[PDB]
Design a protein around this ligand. Sequence first.
Ligand code: SF4
Ligand code: SF4
Ligand code: SF4
Ligand code: SF4
Ligand code: FES
Ligand SMILES: [Ca+2]
Lengths: 146, 905, 588
Amino acid sequence: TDFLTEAHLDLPMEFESIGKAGSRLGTALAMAVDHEINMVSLVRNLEEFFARESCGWCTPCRDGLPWSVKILRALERGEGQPGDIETLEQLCRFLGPGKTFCAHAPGAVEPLQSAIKYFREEFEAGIKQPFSNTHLINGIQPNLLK
Amino acid sequence: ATIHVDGKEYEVNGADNLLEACLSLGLDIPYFCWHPALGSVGACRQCAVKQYQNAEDTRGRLVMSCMTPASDGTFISIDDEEAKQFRESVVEWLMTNHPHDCPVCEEGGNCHLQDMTVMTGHSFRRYRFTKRTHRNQDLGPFISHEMNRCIACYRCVRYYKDYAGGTDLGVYGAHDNVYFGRPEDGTLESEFSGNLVEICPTGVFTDKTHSERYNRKWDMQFAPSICQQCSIGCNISPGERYGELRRIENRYNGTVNHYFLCDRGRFGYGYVNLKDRPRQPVQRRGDDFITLNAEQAMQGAADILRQSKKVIGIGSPRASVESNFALRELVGEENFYTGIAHGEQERLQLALKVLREGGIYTPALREIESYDAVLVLGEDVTQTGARVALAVRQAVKGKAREMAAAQKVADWQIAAILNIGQRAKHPLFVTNVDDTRLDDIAAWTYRAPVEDQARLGFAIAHALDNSAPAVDGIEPELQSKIDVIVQALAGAKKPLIISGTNAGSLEVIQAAANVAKALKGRGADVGITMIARSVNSMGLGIMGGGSLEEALTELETGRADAVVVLENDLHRHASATRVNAALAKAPLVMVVDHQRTAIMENAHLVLSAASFAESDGTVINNEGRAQRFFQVYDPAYYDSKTVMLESWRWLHSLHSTLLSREVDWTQLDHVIDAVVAKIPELAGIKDAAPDATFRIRGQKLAREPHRYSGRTAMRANISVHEPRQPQDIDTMFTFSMEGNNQPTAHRSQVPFAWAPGWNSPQAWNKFQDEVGGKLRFGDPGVRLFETSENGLDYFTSVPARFQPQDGKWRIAPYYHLFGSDELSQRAPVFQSRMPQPYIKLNPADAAKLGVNAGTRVSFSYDGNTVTLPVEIAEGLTAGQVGLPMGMSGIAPVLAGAHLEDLKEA
Amino acid sequence: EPAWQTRDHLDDPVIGELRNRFGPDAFTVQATRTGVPVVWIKREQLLEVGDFLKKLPKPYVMLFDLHGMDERLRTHREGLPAADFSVFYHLISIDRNRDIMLKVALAENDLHVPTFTKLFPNANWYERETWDLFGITFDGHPNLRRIMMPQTWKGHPLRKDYPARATEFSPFELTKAKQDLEMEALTFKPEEWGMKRGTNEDFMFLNLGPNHPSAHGAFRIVLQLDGEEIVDCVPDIGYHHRGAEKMGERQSWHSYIPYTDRIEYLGGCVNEMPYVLAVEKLAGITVPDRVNVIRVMLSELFRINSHLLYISTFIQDVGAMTPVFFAFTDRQKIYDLVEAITGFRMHPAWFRIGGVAHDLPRGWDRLLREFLDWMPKRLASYEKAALQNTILKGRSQGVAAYGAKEALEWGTTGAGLRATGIDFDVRKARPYSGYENFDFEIPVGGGVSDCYTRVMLKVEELRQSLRILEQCLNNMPEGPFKADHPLTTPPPKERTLQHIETLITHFLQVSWGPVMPANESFQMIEATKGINSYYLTSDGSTMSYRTRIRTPSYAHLQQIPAAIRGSLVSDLIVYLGSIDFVMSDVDR
Ligand code: SF4
Ligand code: SF4
Ligand code: SF4
Ligand code: SF4
Ligand code: FES
Ligand SMILES: [Ca+2]
């Protein structure tokens, strides 16, 4: 389920009330996160669980949850690069309902997108390194894209 | 149904899903996990389109086109921006773990994943992390395994398990560690495992036989041909590079063999590339073997034959219709002999008489899958006519198809269909001397000698119709099984009876004809299928002639002093000692063949005939369809000393030199016209393919792709001067890329499927009228005969039951897909796949003889003692001994014969 | 909206004028990526439509191109009339700065069109080539003989069922053609070539080929002479026909680029430019600014190379044998820079679909600066030593003069057109490849196109190209040398070497070929010798369905008899030296 802030604490535990707040009632067993817990590490743990519990049937969950896991691992260690949060948002958009074979992957990307929506300063703090995907090959001048 | 794709209106079939409907309209939607023969599962998530609820809708919703019905009034968009982004994202997700392998991958240039990566427009990598890897498995001599390239599309497991009925392939593991393969290293046991190299959209499963002498798809010279390894007549695309047959691909034929071959047809082609093949005519003078060119061979052969008093010709079911006809015209009709034995010829002519005089429709191979109950009598279909066994498996799953259709479940929703019809299946009743590969899906399997299987068939026919002759002496348990079969057959709307000549029994074919007639008299839509032995067994049966025994009698009595043997080793149809004696007595033996056979030691002249890859001709398959095969390559392009001509060209030139002392070679259509003028029963072979003057808007049909490479260097080591391009006066195809291979070209013979953006076998979608259906302008091949107006009478001669006599062992035929066909044994890759030849014994008979499993026993047939190890066959009836037909030293003529003095060595 | 977008051009005033004159149902407008309105006209209305376009208030005064297309194998013909063959007419209005492509559909059995020669006289050679290569008969043509192939040639090579490859060589056919070569002087009939009065009992006949010791190529002109005066002359061309368009149908979009090099073999990258721009229009590629500047720099370097060869060879043809040595030294300086950048001298084949083959090597600016310091004093020395010589002026001034109307009616472009005072340069009228970002002038003449006026115009064009090169040296953008489009062929090499999706794109692009979606594209550029253009038809495959190359040397050679009639033969040699043609451009 999507993370909610302290402002949403004054809301009745109904399906329609939590549905209009941008989350789900779910099993109605709420979990509280304090100020000590880093949101990036918590979302990394959640996505690690969700990626290793994929059944492997369909491409977006099976091949995109490990990408989000690796991005969150890099953000945890301060090895984040530009475009990582954009990749996480694209994964949120493209792992929604109707795009995967079952509802496991929309539930996987709900906490990631809610924590990005509410705690974006913690995810942006992990991006330190410049984006690098290639190494230099001697004798070939790279296409310097601007 | 009416759909609107991107503002354009289209009329489609409402029973189709959106993906196949749009692919049939020429629209390009990327897809991985869907196949036309396997149905839709919605795994890869590549086929996304945007569906709108009404015409005035802007938001829409991303849906899977393969899982969405193409209902009337649908509104979708393929080129919607969000749909394009999602399809590109799916390709990008598949590319994150894909290895950097395209230069050293056999799928390169023939890869569906490459084509869909290019089609989505994804060429920029932003993934920077590690890629998962996998260890590979040893899958046997035919299939190479490379699990790094897997995209987890589940097509291999779906085809192999659900379609092919295989059991040793599966998916293991979990989330992104999904592994597709066997539970342990070993050979893939399915007879149709070779179709994985086309089913798999990546380079995981590849052709190992091709991978030995690998070349890319654009470098191949292709021709439309017919597989020569049994009588089914599956359409193939052989591809050649540098003068050798490199690969056999499946050529789509919507009526025969649509997407799938068997492993014998796919990997048994290696005899073409054998180094011991005759390449020039060779004349034996004393102990010398002089090499002649074509004109000297024709002149010398014509002079010696003109000196002779009576020359006889021995044809073969291996040779095409034109070559057998040319031999028949050279020696005369009264002197022409079919090269098969008298019993084999009698069974073949009975099968032909049932097919074209029984008044019962014989189905094509695709039509077999639409039947409701199957009775197989005598024929081990998986080992002799394997593609018919695959079609029978589809016909058996038809019951779950009907049960799901009763619940308004679409035909492409294959998972729901398999869930509804859990283990229910259409009735299958197979009879054999032992267990078969169809026993897992068979409702009943009857292991009995061929007389008892014939008696079971006659009893079934009598129980269906009391006018049929009755069987006296049926046990009550066997009677209950007979009543089960009769109740299943009478309740079927479309029963199918399958028999053939491989059982070695006339009575089995007679019983199958009686069952088909009894079902026809009850108003059922009964079909009958006869499986013949060789590629042109039915053509040789239609042409007719004497048996091999009569030809050997003519040679032994001295009434014939010259014999011309056409593409026949003569040891598979008669005893070797008799053949060698008759050929040694004959003062002139002339062997026209493409394989180094044992009778060429006694041959005074050897004509280097062409194989199917170097020849054109017509073959008649088991259903009576005449099919033309075309020459793949010129044998003389690289080796200019090679004089290897078509057999009909050799025999026509020999006849011309015998008559007028002048050499006229021929043209192929001239021989076709001679066939249809002299033999009216073969008049349909004229329309099997158009003549050599056929053009597509004035141009010929290309044999090789547009990007064929190395044209100024492939022969540059022999000479830097480029040779003359080989002319094809015989057919409409050209030995170059200067021709037409458009998917919209008005033709039925397609050498290979390529379309821009579709380099894989999925280009056959572009070549079809609708995807998974027929070819756009009809499938090639024409049936020689129609269903007869009236049928035959009931065969009264019911055989007695099998009685085990002391000192005589009835030979039970055991056929092997790798080893029973004559030319496929010569392929070096089959020796590692061919089983070691044992002899099958009942436990009671082995205990009576005091022999265990594996010990060597020696038996004499025709005064020749041979020794074999022993396996204990539980299902084999006592008094019988089981022998592998078609192996080295064991002729297929031994089926139904008896054995003497079989004892431990 | 990008410049490569598919447009119907229904907002063009010529479409409204044609609708008002002939009716809405008289023609069909085709949406293309050619950038011009494409109008399918009925065959019986073709002469009326041509006359109406000729008599417009700002009329279409030049027949830019005329050729055919075999439509029998074309699968994607949506929105097109039924046609087995077609004939297209590209007409240019300079006053409107516009052009229109008329198209006539032809059935396979009825392959005849009315001739366009009464409206535009360059339609003579264009229709002769269309008859030669496609078998389309033009009714009313004065002499419809073969112009590329010899007269005893069977079949029409540009038809889709004609095999492209070389046939087997036979010494018997060579001996037979030698016998016709030796018997041509005896069996010369002066009516097959289109002449009359074949020996007034004094009109001698002369042959000037086909062994020409010059760099423009070898071609025959048969001259009818009254003493030293040229009464009539027809040129015999096609001795350098390479089947380049047919090869355009036989090579992939990427692998055809070296063949584009050898069209005008003194042009190099200038020849590559319209082909890659038209393919990029088909692919929907907009190249970055650095690609535009790099391609402009290489085009201007090769333009200076070609102009140096042209001026030196003209001076040699006049009789001064010395300046060609120094001009080839300057060409060697240019070749030093071009070898450094592209790895090759004359046919670099360096432009790519979506960019160029490599980045500029480190240190190129030093070579460009050295050449820019070397050139102007050498150019001034050539001017003072030979171009201001009064003997050269007497050989060149007033020789083979024509005006604006004669240049317009013969399709003359380049310096020959601009010496008549008509300011028409493609780099300013229809800008391409970022030529708007450069400050340069277009030299124009006073109104007469002499040999001397054409040569001085080319000298001024050389100076303006030096100015463009100076601006190229001073302002080099930093960026990519290849576009980021998925159809950029090939992709950047380092990403091919380490990324799998890029490797897949490269694998399929270099082997099967890049897949261009089915469309028609057109690019016209100012080449070194006039206006060069590529008209490309894609049927949706990795090969061009039709590659039509319009070259200016064809038009100039056809213009020759209208400009040299009544002159001397030395004047003909000077005129040939001042045309700036190569025979590979003419025949191609
Ligand atoms: S979203 Fe569901 S069906 Fe798809 S792989 Fe994940 S768990 Fe399996
Ligand atoms: S399976 Fe296809 S994409 Fe993968 S390495 Fe092989 S050719 Fe390349
Ligand atoms: S091995 Fe091939 S067919 Fe099987 S899931 Fe992987 S990519 Fe698909
Ligand atoms: S079933 Fe017979 S004809 Fe078909 S591929 Fe196998 S051997 Fe060839
Ligand atoms: S083809 Fe539809 S999801 Fe795979
Ligand atoms: Ca042939």
